[PDB]
Design an enzyme around this catalytic site. Structure first.
Site, PDB file in Angstrom:
ATOM      1  N   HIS A 133      -6.820  -6.327  -2.166  1.00  0.00           N
ATOM      2  CA  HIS A 133      -5.800  -5.520  -1.506  1.00  0.00           C
ATOM      3  C   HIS A 133      -5.536  -6.064  -0.106  1.00  0.00           C
ATOM      4  O   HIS A 133      -6.339  -5.872   0.817  1.00  0.00           O
ATOM      5  CB  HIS A 133      -6.245  -4.061  -1.415  1.00  0.00           C
ATOM      6  CG  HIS A 133      -5.144  -3.128  -1.019  1.00  0.00           C
ATOM      7  ND1 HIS A 133      -4.079  -2.845  -1.846  1.00  0.00           N
ATOM      8  CD2 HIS A 133      -4.921  -2.445   0.130  1.00  0.00           C
ATOM      9  CE1 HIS A 133      -3.245  -2.031  -1.223  1.00  0.00           C
ATOM     10  NE2 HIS A 133      -3.732  -1.773  -0.023  1.00  0.00           N
ATOM     11  N   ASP A 160      -7.572  -6.603  -6.706  1.00  0.00           N
ATOM     12  CA  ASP A 160      -7.301  -5.424  -5.888  1.00  0.00           C
ATOM     13  C   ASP A 160      -7.977  -4.211  -6.527  1.00  0.00           C
ATOM     14  O   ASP A 160      -7.672  -3.852  -7.659  1.00  0.00           O
ATOM     15  CB  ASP A 160      -5.785  -5.224  -5.793  1.00  0.00           C
ATOM     16  CG  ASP A 160      -5.393  -4.091  -4.860  1.00  0.00           C
ATOM     17  OD1 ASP A 160      -4.271  -4.145  -4.317  1.00  0.00           O
ATOM     18  OD2 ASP A 160      -6.192  -3.150  -4.678  1.00  0.00           O
ATOM     19  N   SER A 203       0.838  -1.197   0.000  1.00  0.00           N
ATOM     20  CA  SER A 203       0.000   0.000   0.000  1.00  0.00           C
ATOM     21  C   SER A 203       0.877   1.253   0.000  1.00  0.00           C
ATOM     22  O   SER A 203       1.782   1.386  -0.819  1.00  0.00           O
ATOM     23  CB  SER A 203      -0.907  -0.029   1.239  1.00  0.00           C
ATOM     24  OG  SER A 203      -1.665   1.160   1.381  1.00  0.00           O
TER      25      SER A 203
END
Ligand SMILES: *[C@@H]1O[C@H](CO)[C@@H](O[C@@H]2O[C@H](CO)[C@@H](O[C@@H]3O[C@H](CO[C@H]4O[C@H](CO)[C@@H](O)[C@H](O)[C@@H]4O)[C@@H](O)[C@H](O[C@H]4O[C@H](CO)[C@@H](O)[C@H](O)[C@@H]4O)[C@@H]3O)[C@H](O)[C@H]2NC(C)=O)[C@H](O)[C@H]1NC(C)=O
Length: 318
Positions: A135, A101, A19
């Protein structure tokens, strides 16, 4: 507690993250390519300098960020605001995304791939896609509290039946001894992220996993810095990133320290590179310019702090 010095070779340093920690891994890898001189790894991150001249949401949610200016800036800043981009040609770079994601996304990572394609030969860049993964940090075990690899929710660490930590370390360093299949030999040290080891947007405590072999000082170790993502700081999920991401079992049989710097949720609104002002409630690493125009350049306060931690750790080299 003070951050110790260890017997670590300064030539064996690398970094990775998820991230905003992925974004930061690349910022460090680019801006301080001399310090992180083996390479870096990006799990579900994005282009170096992505959010400087386009709004941050264009670098997320599986959008298609432009890398025209970001790439131009790398070329322009080479040797000044960042270490010579020539260095990048001699770096192992690992990349990963889940195909599902929708928080950062394949399209964003594809743009990072293209960008790096201007500076590092494809042979040294591995870009892995786990089909169906959302994610989340990919592991191959059921860490306590893990969310499903099919549902992106706190702590954003999953059993995706893929050893992401191992893959990244092997791509960066090459052949590794098999990961520890039993209890770890070491401890998770805490240290004060204060003074030169700290910065705006960072917690006052960081951690590092130190194998028994690296603690004694009798063995030369390497150093990998692992950066949590947004909503993954200690403040949000405690020790779950430190414990559940799978770096430690590889470090433990391979004379490697894993440093885990910690950001912190920050509800103060700050001017950012693009789009006006923004707070940092999720405790992300600074990839948008919350804490300086130089956030992804040499001198950026969070990068400077992390590099400070690295320099301290490797200062004990024997
Ligand atoms: C990132 O990815 C790139 C691309 O794969 C890697 O770069 C290659 O690295 C290999 C190994 O280091 C290089 O292989 C060596 O090539 C020499 C010839 O180079 C000439 O030609 C190239 C273009 O093809 C020019 O760039 C270069 O300037 C030269 O004109 C050989 O002479 C070498 O052989 C000798 O050394 C070896 C090792 O000691 C001995 O075993 C041999 O007996 C011999 O003495 C060698 O084969 C290759 O040239 C590089 N290509 C590129 C892109 O230039 C990077 O290494 C990789 N990043 C890293 C370091 O991970």
């Amino acid at each position: 507690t003070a951050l110790p010095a260890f017997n670590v070779n300064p030539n064996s340093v690398s970094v990775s993250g998820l991230s905003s920690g992925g974004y930061m891994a690349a910022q460090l890898g680019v801006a301080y390519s001399d310090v992180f001189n083996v390479g870096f790894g990006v799990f579900a991150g994005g282009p170096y300098d992505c959010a400087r001249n386009q709004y941050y949401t264009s670098c997320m949610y599986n959008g298609y960020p432009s890398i025209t200016t970001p790439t131009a800036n790398m070329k322009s800043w080479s040797g000044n605001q960042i270490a010579s981009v020539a260095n990048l040609g001699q770096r192992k770079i690992y990349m990963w995304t889940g195909s599902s994601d929708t928080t950062v996304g394949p399209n964003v990572m594809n743009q990072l791939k293209a960008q790096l394609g201007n500076f590092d030969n494809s042979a040294n860049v591995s870009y892995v896609t786990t089909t169906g993964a959302v994610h989340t940090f990919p592991t191959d075990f059921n860490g306590a509290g893990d969310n499903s690899c099919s549902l992106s929710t706190s702590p954003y660490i999953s059993n995706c039946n893929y050893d992401g930590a191992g893959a990244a370390l092997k791509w960066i360093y090459g052949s590794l001894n098999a990961r520890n299949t039993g209890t770890l030999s070491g401890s998770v040290l805490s240290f004060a992220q204060s003074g030169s080891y700290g910065a705006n947007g960072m917690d006052t405590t960081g951690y590092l996993y130190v194998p028994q072999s690296c603690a004694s000082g009798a063995t030369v170790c390497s150093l990998h810095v692992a950066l949590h993502g947004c909503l993954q700081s200690y403040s949000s999920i405690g020790s779950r990133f430190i414990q559940n991401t799978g770096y430690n079992k590889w470090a433990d049989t391979n004379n490697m320290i894993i440093l885990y710097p910690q950001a912190i949720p920050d509800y103060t609104i700050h001017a950012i590179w693009n789009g006006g002002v923004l707070s940092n409630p999720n405790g992300c690493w600074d990839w948008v310019g919350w804490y300086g125009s130089n956030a992804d350049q040499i001198g950026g306060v969070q990068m400077a702090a992390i590099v400070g931690q690295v320099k301290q750790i490797v200062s004990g080299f024997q």
